[PDB]
RNA sequence: GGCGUCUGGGGGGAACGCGGGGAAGUGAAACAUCUCAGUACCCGUAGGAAGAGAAAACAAAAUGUGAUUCCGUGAGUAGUGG
RNA sequence: GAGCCCGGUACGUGAAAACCCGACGUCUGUCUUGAUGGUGUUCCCGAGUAGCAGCGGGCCCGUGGAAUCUGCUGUGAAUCUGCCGGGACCACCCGGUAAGCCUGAAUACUUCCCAGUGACCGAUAGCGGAUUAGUACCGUGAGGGAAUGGUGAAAAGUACCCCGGGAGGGGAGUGAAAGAGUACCUGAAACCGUGCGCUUACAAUCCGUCAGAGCCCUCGACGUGUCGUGGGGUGAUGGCGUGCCUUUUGAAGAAUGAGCCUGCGAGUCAGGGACAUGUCGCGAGGUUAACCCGGGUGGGGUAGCCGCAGCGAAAGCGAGUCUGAAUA
């Protein structure tokens, strides 16, 4: 049998030119009338996962 | 390829068996209470030879501190002369004169006697 | 001259297993596991946090789609051109793959990295900006199909 | 290139014939070849071996007695693994051995084992084993006496020499094999191997092209 | 409808086929959508195999394939999903 | 422990009859009262079908923008500038000609029969069943469902005498062996005795351990018995000393489990799976899957997969790329 991907996490992360793991920040897709553009600026873009979760991803994205 | 495990595991049994001969009652017929015993026959082995050192040490006291109270001194000044004389005679066969040939033992009681300070209660 | 008896694997290959739960002299009673649990008995789903919302749950989706119809060429750069043909000539796409430089059913694409010294008159089915003018300014001819 | 003198049944020298360099005198290598070996043996291992689990045995789907009141031991059938009679647990299943094994690390163990007969001059090539089309062992034992006098031997034999290869199979050490199906394992095992001389070419040139 | 007369059925069988009906424990760390599963079981039926089969088919501008069935890949991907 | 003793094997030979495969004919049907190529119009090309609507099923697709396939209820067309498909739909282009029916080979299986194979089990294993086996036995019934292999080369299975009611035994015999006597190969442990050596009836003992008097046995040297780089068995007496496993902050624990012995009883397997780490082959390349040819483990098999260029949602650009009005 082969090993099915996890279908959540491969929706939300990506792999890079080296190997990287990236993600994309929360808090940006509603009730941000009060949240200023500093608050929205810093919240957009892929970041680096942290390499506390880098184990755990690394396993739902390849099995 | 199925294993039967009699010869692998008879090996061990034989070996505690044996080696529990001479136990009173079950201790000596059943591999399960037998092996009970060699864990606290070994354990208390092992216990006892670092024990034994300092037992014997003890017995070999008594008998110079019994011939020394003979020849009228007491065991701690007996060592504290003999330390002082120079005499370096351990406690084993010093018990073993005081017991066999009274005559050198009086003369190191001698020895002892004449290296102690003049008052052995002096702040010196 | 050497037998079967002679035949000895490399030194590091082979490695003896680690028997589980074969008394306790050296795995025992618990094979590793510890005291009692969950972990104890079965075993934890990978994807599991304790309740609170996983890591893959708790994260924005990421943005897009794939554009199913993406037409993704196959590269290769001048300078690899260069280090594979040092006397010049015609090079196909045949040619590439015979030198193995892509693969065989691909759609090549030509891209200008390295340094172009050769008269050659490549054909691939497109050229970046900089691989017309390293190809032609070696006095070279870019044909595409 | 070693220089193989052949021989012929009458003890008459016909010619010689070429090994080439390429294919008889690569430098053994014996890890190589000790994981070639070892996975012609798993192939050849059939895997029939089986027991039943607890599933499979026959019976015991009733709760034998209460979970409570009863005092004994809390049982869920009479199968279980550790009654007698009981399923087996970790049991043996039907598997198959063979593993998959490169082909140039397959081909490359078959010249290093030719290779070191050569360089010892085990090998030997032969026009024919015995006079056609009439079998007879007596003169094929004599024969590879005369060439050889150790205990184990391997002929290679073109799959038409018939003559050839059923008179030397009597024999309690010789062992023939078809030059196409030249395999690691046969050319270890033995102390010689006496060519054929239309199979050794046979073998040369399915190569060397 | 009643007669008389000729030919047929009826029941059994371990697996495999085809067409119907069709759960629950379980996983979801609860659960109803969902999964388990069109699985277990039941029904009607043949055969030595059955079913499918000779384009109201794919395809994508190539002057391409050309009945069905069965393996390997495509691929745990495109997608779908409280 | 047999190639040369037997059954056989290699290799050949054998069918009255029945059945099965072929093959050649009787026989059956069809074309020849027939074909080939040309021109311009009317008729035909599968009907309560297609299509549409309501409610469902199923397709990667959980009704979603929901195509194609299909069930039930209504509504209900055209016959070729016709009709249906090219993921709502519309136009153009392309493919096909539904509502009629048969079709072998490639494919799945083994109740049964024949010949084989095993880095499979060897009597608590392997089928539940090596023996009365789905038998005995349990249940009204559906159903549940066991235990028991081995004397010896041959039975030569102990004639005859003695004790005894018999069972059983002792002589005598067969036997290589009766430490093989139909309770029979080998014959362990728990458990049960008999004989001998040491010790024990003023004594508080997780039953041992370290010292250790006496008695008994043994191996040497030296005399009557006496020592020794000695070995064994018992142990009077002194010192020390709170079972094993689980599970606990903590158990000798008055927390749990074990009456004893012998058998049996728990990290295994599948997948070109995922990650990591050794070792081996080739190396900017590595490798085949299915399948085909070989009584084999060998040879072929380029379809695919991984590496070889990245960025971007994507169009795209490319040693750059995205954001951005920006070389910011």
Same mark, same amino acid.
């Given at each position: 049998p082969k090993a099915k991907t996890h279908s959540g996490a491969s929706k939300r992360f990506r792999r890079t030119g080296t190997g990287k793991i990236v993600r994309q920040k929360a808090? *940006? *897709?509603?009730?941000?009338?009060?949240?200023p553009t500093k608050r929205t600026r810093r919240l957009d873009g892929r970041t680096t996962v942290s390499a506390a979760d880098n184990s755990r991803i690394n396993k739902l994205l390849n099995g | 390829a199925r294993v039967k495990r009699a010869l692998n595991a008879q090996k061990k049994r034989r070996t505690v068996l044996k080696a529990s001969k001479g136990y009173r009652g079950q201790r000596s017929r059943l591999y399960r209470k037998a092996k009970e015993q060699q864990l606290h026959s070994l354990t208390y082995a092992y216990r006892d030879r670092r024990a034994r050192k300092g037992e014997f040490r003890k017995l070999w006291i008594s008998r110079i501190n019994a011939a020394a109270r003979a020849n009228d001194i007491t065991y701690n000044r007996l060592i504290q002369g003999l330390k002082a004389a120079g005499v370096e005679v351990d406690r084993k066969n010093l018990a073993e004169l005081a017991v066999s040939d009274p005559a050198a033992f009086t003369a190191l009681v001698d020895v002892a006697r004449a290296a102690l300070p003049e008052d052995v209660n002096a702040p010196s | 001259v050497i037998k079967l008896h002679d035949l000895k694997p490399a030194p590091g290959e082979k490695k003896a297993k680690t028997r589980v739960g074969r008394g306790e002299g050296s795995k025992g009673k618990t094979a590793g596991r510890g005291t009692k649990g969950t972990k104890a008995r079965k075993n934890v789903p990978v994807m599991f946090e304790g309740g609170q919302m996983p890591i893959h749950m708790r994260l924005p989706k990421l943005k897009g789609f794939k554009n199913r119809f993406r037409t993704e060429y196959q590269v290769v750069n001048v300078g690899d051109i260069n280090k594979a043909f040092p006397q010049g000539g015609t090079v196909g796409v045949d040619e590439l793959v015979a030198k193995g430089l892509?693969?065989?059913?691909s759609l090549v694409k030509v891209l200008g990295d390295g340094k172009l010294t050769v008269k050659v008159d490549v054909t691939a089915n497109k050229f970046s900006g900089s691989a017309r003018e390293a190809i032609t300014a070696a006095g070279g001819s870019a044909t595409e199909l | 290139t070693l220089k193989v003198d052949v021989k012929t049944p009458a003890g008459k020298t016909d010619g010689s014939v070429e090994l080439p360099a390429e294919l008889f005198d690569v430098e053994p290598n014996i890890a190589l070849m000790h994981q070639v070996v070892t996975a012609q043996l798993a192939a050849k291992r059939q895997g029939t071996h089986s027991t039943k689990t607890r599933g499979e045995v026959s019976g015991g789907g009733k709760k034998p007695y209460r979970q409570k009141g009863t005092g004994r031991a809390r049982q869920g059938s009479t199968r279980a693994p550790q009654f007698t009679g009981g399923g087996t647990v970790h049991g043996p299943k039907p598997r198959d051995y063979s593993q998959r094994t490169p082909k140039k690390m397959i081909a490359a163990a078959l010249r290093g084992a030719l290779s070191d007969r050569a360089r010892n001059d085990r090998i030997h090539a032969v026009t024919?084993?015995? #006079?056609?089309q009439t079998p007879s062992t007596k003169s094929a034992k004599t024969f590879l006496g005369t060439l050889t006098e150790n205990k184990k031997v391997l002929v290679v034999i073109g799959?038409?020499? #018939?003559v050839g290869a059923k008179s030397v199979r009597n024999l309690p050490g010789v062992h023939v094999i078809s030059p196409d199906q030249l395999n690691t394992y046969d050319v270890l095992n033995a102390d010689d191997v006496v060519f054929s001389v239309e199979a050794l070419n046979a073998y040369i040139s399915a190569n060397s092209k």
């Open positions: 808090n *940006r *897709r509603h009730l941000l009338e009060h949240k | - | 892509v693969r065989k059913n | 024919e084993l015995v #006079e056609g799959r038409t020499d #018939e």
